[PDB]
Amino acid sequence: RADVAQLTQELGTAFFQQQQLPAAMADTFLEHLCLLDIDSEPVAARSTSIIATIGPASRSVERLKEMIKAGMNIARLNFSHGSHEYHAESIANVREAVESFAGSPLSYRPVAIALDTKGPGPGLSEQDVRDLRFGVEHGVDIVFASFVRKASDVAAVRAALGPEGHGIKIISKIENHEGVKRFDEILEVSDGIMVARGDLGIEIPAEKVFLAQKMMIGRCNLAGKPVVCATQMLESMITKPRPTRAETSDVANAVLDGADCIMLSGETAKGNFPVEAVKMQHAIAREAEAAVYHRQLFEELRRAAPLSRDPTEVTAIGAVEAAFKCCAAAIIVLTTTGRSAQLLSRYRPRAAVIAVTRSAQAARQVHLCRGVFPLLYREPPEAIWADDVDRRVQFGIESGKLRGFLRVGDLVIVVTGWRPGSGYTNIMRVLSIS
Amino acid sequence: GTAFFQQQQLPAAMADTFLEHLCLLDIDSEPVAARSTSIIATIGPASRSVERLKEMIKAGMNIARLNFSHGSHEYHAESIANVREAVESFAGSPLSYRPVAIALDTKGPGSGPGLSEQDVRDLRFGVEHGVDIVFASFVRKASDVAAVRAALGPEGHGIKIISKIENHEGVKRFDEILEVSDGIMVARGDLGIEIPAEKVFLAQKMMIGRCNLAGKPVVCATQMLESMITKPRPTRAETSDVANAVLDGADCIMLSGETAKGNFPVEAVKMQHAIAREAEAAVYHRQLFEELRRAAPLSRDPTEVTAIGAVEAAFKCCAAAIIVLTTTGRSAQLLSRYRPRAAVIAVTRSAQAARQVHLCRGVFPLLYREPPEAIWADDVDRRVQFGIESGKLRGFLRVGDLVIVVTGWRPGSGYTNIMRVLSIS
Amino acid sequence: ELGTAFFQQQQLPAAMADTFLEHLCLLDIDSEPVAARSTSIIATIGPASRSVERLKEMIKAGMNIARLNFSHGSHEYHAESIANVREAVESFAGSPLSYRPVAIALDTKGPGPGLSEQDVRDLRFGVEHGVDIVFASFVRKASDVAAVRAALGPEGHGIKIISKIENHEGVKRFDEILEVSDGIMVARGDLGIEIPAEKVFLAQKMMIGRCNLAGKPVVCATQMLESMITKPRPTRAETSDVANAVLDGADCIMLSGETAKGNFPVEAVKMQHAIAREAEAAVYHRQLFEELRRAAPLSRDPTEVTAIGAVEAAFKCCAAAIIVLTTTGRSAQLLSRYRPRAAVIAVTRSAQAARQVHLCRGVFPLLYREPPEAIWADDVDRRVQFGIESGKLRGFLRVGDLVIVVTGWRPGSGYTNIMRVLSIS
Amino acid sequence: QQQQLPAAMADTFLEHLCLLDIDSEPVAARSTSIIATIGPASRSVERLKEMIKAGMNIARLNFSHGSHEYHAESIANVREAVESFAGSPLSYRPVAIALDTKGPGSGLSEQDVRDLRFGVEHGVDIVFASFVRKASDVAAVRAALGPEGHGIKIISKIENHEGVKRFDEILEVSDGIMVARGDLGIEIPAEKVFLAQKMMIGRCNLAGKPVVCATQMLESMITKPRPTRAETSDVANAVLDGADCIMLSGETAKGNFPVEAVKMQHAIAREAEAAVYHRQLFEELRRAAPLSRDPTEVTAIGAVEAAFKCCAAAIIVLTTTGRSAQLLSRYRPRAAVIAVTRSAQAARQVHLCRGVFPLLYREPPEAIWADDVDRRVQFGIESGKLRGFLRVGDLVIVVTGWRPGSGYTNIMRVLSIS
Numbered sequence A: 001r002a003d004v005a006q007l008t009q010e011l012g013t014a015f016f017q018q019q020q021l022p023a024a025m026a027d028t029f030l031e032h033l034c035l036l037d038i039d040s041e042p043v044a045a046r047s048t049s050i051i052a053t054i055g056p057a058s059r060s061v062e063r064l065k066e067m068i069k070a071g072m073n074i075a076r077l078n079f080s081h082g083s084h085e086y087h088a089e090s091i092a093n094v095r096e097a098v099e100s101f102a103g104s105p106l107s108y109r110p111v112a113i114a115l116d117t118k119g120p121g122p123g124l125s126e127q128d129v130r131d132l133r134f135g136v137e138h139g140v141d142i143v144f145a146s147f148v149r150k151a152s153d154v155a156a157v158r159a160a161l162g163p164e165g166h167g168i169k170i171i172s173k174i175e176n177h178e179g180v181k182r183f184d185e186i187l188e189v190s191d192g193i194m195v196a197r198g199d200l201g202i203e204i205p206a207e208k209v210f211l212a213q214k215m216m217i218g219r220c221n222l223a224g225k226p227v228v229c230a231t232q233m234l235e236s237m238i239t240k241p242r243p244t245r246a247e248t249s250d251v252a253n254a255v256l257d258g259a260d261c262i263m264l265s266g267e268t269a270k271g272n273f274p275v276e277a278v279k280m281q282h283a284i285a286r287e288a289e290a291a292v293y294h295r296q297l298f299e300e301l302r303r304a305a306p307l308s309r310d311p312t313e314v315t316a317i318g319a320v321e322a323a324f325k326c327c328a329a330a331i332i333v334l335t336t337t338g339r340s341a342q343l344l345s346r347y348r349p350r351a352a353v354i355a356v357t358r359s360a361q362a363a364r365q366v367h368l369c370r371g372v373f374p375l376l377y378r379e380p381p382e383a384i385w386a387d388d389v390d391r392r393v394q395f396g397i398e399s400g401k402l403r404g405f406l407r408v409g410d411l412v413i414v415v416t417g418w419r420p421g422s423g424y425t426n427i428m429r430v431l432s433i434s
Numbered sequence B: 001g002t003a004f005f006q007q008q009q010l011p012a013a014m015a016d017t018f019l020e021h022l023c024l025l026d027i028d029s030e031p032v033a034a035r036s037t038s039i040i041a042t043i044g045p046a047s048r049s050v051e052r053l054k055e056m057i058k059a060g061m062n063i064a065r066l067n068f069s070h071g072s073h074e075y076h077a078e079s080i081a082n083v084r085e086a087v088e089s090f091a092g093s094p095l096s097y098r099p100v101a102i103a104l105d106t107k108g109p110g111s112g113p114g115l116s117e118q119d120v121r122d123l124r125f126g127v128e129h130g131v132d133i134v135f136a137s138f139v140r141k142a143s144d145v146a147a148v149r150a151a152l153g154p155e156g157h158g159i160k161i162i163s164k165i166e167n168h169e170g171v172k173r174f175d176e177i178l179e180v181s182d183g184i185m186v187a188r189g190d191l192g193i194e195i196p197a198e199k200v201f202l203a204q205k206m207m208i209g210r211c212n213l214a215g216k217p218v219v220c221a222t223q224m225l226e227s228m229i230t231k232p233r234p235t236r237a238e239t240s241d242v243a244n245a246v247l248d249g250a251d252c253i254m255l256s257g258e259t260a261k262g263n264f265p266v267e268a269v270k271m272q273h274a275i276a277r278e279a280e281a282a283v284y285h286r287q288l289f290e291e292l293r294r295a296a297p298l299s300r301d302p303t304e305v306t307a308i309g310a311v312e313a314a315f316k317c318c319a320a321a322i323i324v325l326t327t328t329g330r331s332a333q334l335l336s337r338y339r340p341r342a343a344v345i346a347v348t349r350s351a352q353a354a355r356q357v358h359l360c361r362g363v364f365p366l367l368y369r370e371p372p373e374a375i376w377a378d379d380v381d382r383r384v385q386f387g388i389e390s391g392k393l394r395g396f397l398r399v400g401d402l403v404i405v406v407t408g409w410r411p412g413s414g415y416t417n418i419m420r421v422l423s424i425s
Numbered sequence C: 001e002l003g004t005a006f007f008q009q010q011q012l013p014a015a016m017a018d019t020f021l022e023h024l025c026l027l028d029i030d031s032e033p034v035a036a037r038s039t040s041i042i043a044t045i046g047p048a049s050r051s052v053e054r055l056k057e058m059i060k061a062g063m064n065i066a067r068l069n070f071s072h073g074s075h076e077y078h079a080e081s082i083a084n085v086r087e088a089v090e091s092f093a094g095s096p097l098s099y100r101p102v103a104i105a106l107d108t109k110g111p112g113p114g115l116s117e118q119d120v121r122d123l124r125f126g127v128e129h130g131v132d133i134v135f136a137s138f139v140r141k142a143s144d145v146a147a148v149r150a151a152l153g154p155e156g157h158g159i160k161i162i163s164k165i166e167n168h169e170g171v172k173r174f175d176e177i178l179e180v181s182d183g184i185m186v187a188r189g190d191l192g193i194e195i196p197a198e199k200v201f202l203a204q205k206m207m208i209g210r211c212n213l214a215g216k217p218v219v220c221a222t223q224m225l226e227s228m229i230t231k232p233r234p235t236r237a238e239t240s241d242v243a244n245a246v247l248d249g250a251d252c253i254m255l256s257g258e259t260a261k262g263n264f265p266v267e268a269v270k271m272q273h274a275i276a277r278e279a280e281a282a283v284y285h286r287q288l289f290e291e292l293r294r295a296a297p298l299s300r301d302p303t304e305v306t307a308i309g310a311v312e313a314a315f316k317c318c319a320a321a322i323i324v325l326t327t328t329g330r331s332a333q334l335l336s337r338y339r340p341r342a343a344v345i346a347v348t349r350s351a352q353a354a355r356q357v358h359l360c361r362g363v364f365p366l367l368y369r370e371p372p373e374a375i376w377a378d379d380v381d382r383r384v385q386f387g388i389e390s391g392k393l394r395g396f397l398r399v400g401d402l403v404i405v406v407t408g409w410r411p412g413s414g415y416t417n418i419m420r421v422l423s424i425s
Numbered sequence D: 001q002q003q004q005l006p007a008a009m010a011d012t013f014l015e016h017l018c019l020l021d022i023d024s025e026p027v028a029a030r031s032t033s034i035i036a037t038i039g040p041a042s043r044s045v046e047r048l049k050e051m052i053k054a055g056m057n058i059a060r061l062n063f064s065h066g067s068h069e070y071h072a073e074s075i076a077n078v079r080e081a082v083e084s085f086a087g088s089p090l091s092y093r094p095v096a097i098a099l100d101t102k103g104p105g106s107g108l109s110e111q112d113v114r115d116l117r118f119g120v121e122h123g124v125d126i127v128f129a130s131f132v133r134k135a136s137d138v139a140a141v142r143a144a145l146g147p148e149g150h151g152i153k154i155i156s157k158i159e160n161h162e163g164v165k166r167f168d169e170i171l172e173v174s175d176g177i178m179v180a181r182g183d184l185g186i187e188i189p190a191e192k193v194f195l196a197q198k199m200m201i202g203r204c205n206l207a208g209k210p211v212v213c214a215t216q217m218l219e220s221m222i223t224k225p226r227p228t229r230a231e232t233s234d235v236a237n238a239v240l241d242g243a244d245c246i247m248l249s250g251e252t253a254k255g256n257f258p259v260e261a262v263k264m265q266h267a268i269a270r271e272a273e274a275a276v277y278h279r280q281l282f283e284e285l286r287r288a289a290p291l292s293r294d295p296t297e298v299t300a301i302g303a304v305e306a307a308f309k310c311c312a313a314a315i316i317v318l319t320t321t322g323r324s325a326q327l328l329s330r331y332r333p334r335a336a337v338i339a340v341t342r343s344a345q346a347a348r349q350v351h352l353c354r355g356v357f358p359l360l361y362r363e364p365p366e367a368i369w370a371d372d373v374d375r376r377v378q379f380g381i382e383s384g385k386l387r388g389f390l391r392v393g394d395l396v397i398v399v400t401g402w403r404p405g406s407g408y409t410n411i412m413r414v415l416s417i418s
């Protein structure tokens, strides 16, 4: 009460009733559950990304525009089906639908393109090598590598991407007992992980999949690397317009577990309700994110994270701590590769991480990190570097004010570096919105 | 031994943080403990055969639900008789006999304001046929619970009333409903139509948490393994839903169409049994017990005081079980509210209490049938010995195990006050 | 119930705090201590406190252990002091409200390498005169304790050896010394000369913490109320020092020159009594009990398992006392290690155990000398009732209070396995 | 490792105590300020120079004794001794001057009005107001300091039952508190003073306001060269309780060993500060501190969190009034708070806040404000290196503002030394 009394007088009682704030202020996890309220509405923008598998039900440019508006952040192309010609047309339709909103920063919404490989079916397959080369040639952002069983499998995928695919992210799919057992070595060499529950549920007893999902999500959260929860999340929506009680619960629990992304497979690739499936995941993720017990989560991420002498890492924890202290509406970060936004995201701030970048690939790939909202800055550089920096911060403060994220009177945390180029983030500023 | 500490997610249970607890979960760590979350199976055309109900009892069914929204009193009386016939077909082996509670799920009020006239007739049918529990549909306020209690009359004083929360009013008036109810059912089917579907998980977790705090049974119900009505295996979302209901703190999990009308009634029970054992081992008891202790108020009731001392003692020695003598089941319920990892073996002479304690997680009822000894202390020991012998036969106990024994100072209900540390011989 | 006034006394608002910082903020000078003083006072007996009349005044002021410093005087001098202590103690054997057992402790002169020749003669004197405790000077390694143990000859294996840590070697080899000792004395006088004076507080807090972890008695000694050797009131630093030794976790606090040679021996005892009562109420039991619990390893010893269950039960109902039957004092010691707020009333037939349990904080001994009953269960009930009657007589209990009773299942030492919740009638 | 780092890494307070090591040496600079009462035993300029070297940070003038002429000579001798080290600006130590009032005796007395006026005329930094028993007593002292004494700090002395009972209202209107144990131990039972001390220290820590522990801390050292075991324990426990300052009264004013008493408090405080269980302390201070929309308050918590993440050697903060350094100090960082200020009064007063090391900036301004700021930050680094706080390769947190003037702190920077 006294630790929120002056902020309650300032922001009002109605502010503290929304986005499960009474449940977030609880002293125990049990009290946190007791304080969850169906009448407490989510205010924050949805932070868990939705990956939609693109197929016959979601191929058209008009349908893809509907899915972008519904919340799709990553388009998945399953190379276990179709052909190179089929997937190239899908890629072109996604890019056409994405560029139909390029007229403004207030309307632009980047969509990453992910290639899900067919898999080994011994080691790296010959069609996997051909498909990975297709991905490099078509400019894919992410590879969902099927049946990764050891660290050498991810090294083989990296080698097959060649020197031109150095920027592509490799998300290793854990689909069998070997992948689960060798998880630490796979995560160490991967950019992220996908909990591929379809095959995992056949390879290990179905009643043990939840243990593997929660363990992998927890370790990925500890490592600060993206983790995707996949397969049968809203399965019944392939034929029905509404999901089952188990399905909405599953989506909410994947977000509560700590998943950075949630996925739709047949629900969007072949189902009768692809847009509705995206809308449903969007709705559940917004509710589940507000119900996250940040008080224990942030304390545990701080206690578990080792000490660091990397200024980006040090600035990120100071910025997230500052954002929680004032209930900052957003954390605006300037990033080239997306790394500074990723280091902010690993501490799970409630404040939106608005990442301003000049890299179109980084803007698409940061969708893998929960709570990161990418803004592609296209303006030519200013003669004075410090003015160019300030212009990019103001671009985020304007796009944020104008897209609801921010309001006059709000506090924002601004994360920048001391010199140009990747790797120099070391400054945190507290700014009041006017 | 080292192998003991690698099983039942003991490395994950020893973790200092919840995050480290999740990281330490092991798919190769096998569950050793008996399944403690009760399975309620709805009876219907797919599960009325005496021989099919015997298979469901062996699979793990603990409570048989009679849905009074379907069928006549004649139909429900036959369900009751077939359940009792299947249950009594195992009474020849008293150390391995499993009591099965009978629950009457009411039709509800409909466009009505309170207790319907059909509900009054069905509630009286339940009292006349000896039902143990009432799952009262669409409870919206405390006066709805009082009307159900009044309709049960003086002969139904022992029947438990589990209020079903199925709409926004029930969720908003939850505290007053829980106060006058014996427990709650999160009726997700109607709740998911009455409130936005994407909010049901918030209502489920809130109600389970409050019930855990109150020490009253909470049931998670509807569509848990829905696809198993026609398919032999459930979806990844369904197994996750069952596991998460157990992790949330549900005392009971339910099957509706999966057992009443589906093609896999036995397999649906076996699947819930398998998931619940895995999920119970993954419970982070270190935080859970500390939070239940911190939140529970001080008490001057000896049953309540003995229960917390016994659960604390069970954790200190990794007791295989807590054997409790109970008349009404209340001493077992007060042990269960602290969520011990040790099984609560409840020895009772009341067949109704033996059936009703299935509402409390981790309570394993043993119905004692022997005629009393003339010396009271000798009769209490004979029942404790019966608890140990059944525990050994069922795999709960072995020679060398430590067990906590909970008894009272005089006969009759309400006098539990002793906790003793016992070594199994 | 208990009333609002009950919850304002003995720093109960500060004890209910969720953080240690909030606990400090809630400390109230107007919140009066209700509980009996639980930290024992050791008074050094010398010229200023040698007379039978003066010793009677010191017993009334709160002296629990009489220390005889064998660094001064002779065997003849100390034998007269022992006889005067026993005479003063027995002058209250008619009044059950005034009778209090007083332990007799021999503080050795000290070492050279191994045990000194004078220490062998003095330890032999202690065995012949029936001393209860040995404060072994300058213990530096485990072999020093073994030498004292061997010197305690065939008739003295029951005497307790409290090793005095007085130098850098004793501090560095602390774990091996504590392992073989019955307890520790933080001998700050020599320690403050052997190591830098500004480091003594680190050694005191470390040794007290480790002793609390081990469940072994720890004494805080030297210059606690030094100025009271010549002045009737202590300094602000002295009262703070006594209070902080109690807050650190000391089982005993000591007076040296303050009682042996000073002008105000009775007043020094009265002052330590007054400060310890205040400091014990200010102990943050919520964190302390949770940390003692979390740090203590799992145990398969029924005495250790019963002790934690009993202390948990005592906290749950705000038990007025924990009555324990003990022949060696071990069951009372295992209760004391969990630092209950309830008084541990130890009923024993052993006069030596009754004197030695003063080393354990919160243990209030009662020597029982009635002839044994033919039925053991009746003999147990008679001693439990003796503990309740003495409790009512001394102010610990009233009709309507709840107590926790700790007994075992069969006679003789080592079988404590029972905890009962009893209502005072 | 050094500075009780194994004990600081412990998961419980019990294991923290068990891990305390007498062989683990303190590395960090002493954070708890020492207030020494100046009198006949510590009046000479030569004696005062030795007390400054021993660790004296605040000179207390007890207006219950002596005269205005006597105390004016003491003030002049303190200033003379302090300025005798001004030739080396990177290692010069500011010393605050505090006036302890006589008190009301049998409201604000007429002698107190004259003494408070003396303090304003002589430029004192702090007032230790005797026998404060309600918020209106603080207001009367504030009024008696007139318009020329707006910048003096008022530390209310709690010396009786009424002051203890009305503590919250007194702390609300005061700059800080002094636990005046001498009178408090006569006004309330002696065995209850420790409860009042620990309660007041805790509440002051919560409020982020300075708290002084005073009277009889090393009493025996008035006549003996070494203190008793109870005295060293008392000093260590006042620091462990959370006191920002510790005081010497008769030990320095009339005692045979004034320099040794200061040296002893310095030695004990360094040991006690290393034994502080920061893991629990920071988590409790952070949890208890309310949410804030003030950028100085928000930057302060972000900076302390960042300092703990990298084991920052120091937090260099630019301050005009000392407020930005005070807001850093309230979170009890292990990193030294090096406060670079151009105000000489702020530099002296900032000794009331634990862990704040004031550096008086006596360098000429740079034309560009961004450059003036960078030279004040380089000044902090250079003094830190010279005084042993910093080494090349160390990480520091730099707390600066967006525009000049008090109240605009909003920037935290992670900087690598050289």
Ligand SMILES: O=C(O)CNS(=O)(=O)c1cc2c(cc1O)C(=O)c1ccccc1C2=O
Residues within 6 Å of the ligand: A053, A054, A055, A056, A077, A078, A079, A080, A081, A082, A083, A086, A264, A265, A266, A267, A269, A270
């Ligand atoms: O992993 C699985 O096997 C199932 N799930 S899916 O990846 O979402 C999926 C992908 C696809 C199609 C359906 C479908 O459900 C499809 O009809 C199709 C038809 C023609 C070409 C490609 C596809 C194609 O890639």
Ligand SMILES: O=C(O)CNS(=O)(=O)c1cc2c(cc1O)C(=O)c1ccccc1C2=O
Residues within 6 Å of the ligand: C044, C045, C046, C047, C068, C069, C070, C071, C072, C073, C074, C077, C189, C255, C256, C257, C258, C260, C261
């Ligand atoms: O040495 C320490 O550790 C502390 N000193 S003490 O043990 O409290 C102490 C004991 C004694 C006397 C004084 C005194 O201070 C005494 O005068 C005396 C006179 C004649 C015979 C015995 C004593 C005797 O035992």
Ligand SMILES: O=P(O)(O)OC[C@H]1O[C@](O)(COP(=O)(O)O)[C@@H](O)[C@@H]1O
Residues within 6 Å of the ligand: A312, A334, A335, A336, A337, A338, A339, A340, A341, A389, A415, A416, A417, A418, A419, A420, A421, A422, A423, A424, A425
């Ligand atoms: O997040 P990354 O990839 O490390 O890049 C962050 C970088 O962006 C900046 O804020 C601005 O740099 P640029 O001028 O290269 O865009 C740098 O100061 C910082 O090093």
Ligand SMILES: O=P(O)(O)OC[C@H]1O[C@](O)(COP(=O)(O)O)[C@@H](O)[C@@H]1O
Residues within 6 Å of the ligand: B303, B325, B326, B327, B328, B329, B330, B331, B332, B406, B407, B408, B409, B410, B411, B412, B413, B414, B415, B416
């Ligand atoms: O849990 P309940 O219903 O309160 O029953 C516990 C009761 O059972 C007993 O242990 C045994 O009593 P009975 O001999 O009547 O079965 C009583 O001492 C105790 O009061």
Ligand SMILES: O=P(O)(O)OC[C@H]1O[C@](O)(COP(=O)(O)O)[C@@H](O)[C@@H]1O
Residues within 6 Å of the ligand: C325, C326, C327, C328, C329, C330, C331, C332, C379, C380, C406, C407, C408, C409, C410, C411, C412, C413, C414, C415, C416
């Ligand atoms: O603390 P100790 O020395 O183990 O004594 C406890 C013993 O006292 C008893 O409670 C009673 O024993 P006695 O009848 O022999 O005195 C035993 O059952 C128990 O083992």
Ligand SMILES: O=P(O)(O)OC[C@H]1O[C@](O)(COP(=O)(O)O)[C@@H](O)[C@@H]1O
Residues within 6 Å of the ligand: D296, D318, D319, D320, D321, D322, D323, D324, D325, D342, D399, D400, D401, D402, D403, D404, D405, D406, D407, D408, D409
């Ligand atoms: O501690 P204070 O009193 O708030 O002052 C800190 C001030 O120091 C600055 O960093 C620089 O101070 P100057 O006015 O001396 O340039 C300001 O931007 C900031 O407001």
Ligand SMILES: O=C([O-])C(=O)[O-]
Residues within 6 Å of the ligand: A146, A173, A175, A195, A196, A197, A198, A199, A200, A230, A231
């Ligand atoms: O391979 C997959 O994507 C799966 O099994 O879910």
Ligand SMILES: O=C([O-])C(=O)[O-]
Residues within 6 Å of the ligand: B137, B164, B166, B186, B187, B188, B189, B190, B191, B221, B222
């Ligand atoms: O009544 C039920 O079981 C429901 O609505 O879910």
Ligand SMILES: O=C([O-])C(=O)[O-]
Residues within 6 Å of the ligand: C137, C166, C186, C187, C188, C189, C190, C191, C221, C222
């Ligand atoms: O003997 C003692 O007590 C000492 O040396 O402190």
Ligand SMILES: O=C([O-])C(=O)[O-]
Residues within 6 Å of the ligand: D157, D159, D179, D180, D181, D182, D183, D184, D214, D215
């Ligand atoms: O003036 C003081 O400091 C006191 O009275 O304690």
Ligand SMILES: [K+]
Residues within 6 Å of the ligand: A078, A079, A080, A116, A117, A118, A119, A146
């Ligand atoms: K695939």
Ligand SMILES: [K+]
Residues within 6 Å of the ligand: B067, B068, B069, B105, B106, B107, B108, B137
């Ligand atoms: K029904």
Ligand SMILES: [K+]
Residues within 6 Å of the ligand: C069, C070, C071, C107, C108, C109, C110, C137
């Ligand atoms: K001695």
Ligand SMILES: [K+]
Residues within 6 Å of the ligand: D062, D063, D064, D100, D101, D102, D103, D130
């Ligand atoms: K004064």
Ligand SMILES: [Mg+2]
Residues within 6 Å of the ligand: A196, A198, A199
């Ligand atoms: Mg697959």
Ligand SMILES: [Mg+2]
Residues within 6 Å of the ligand: B166, B187, B189, B190
């Ligand atoms: Mg329904």
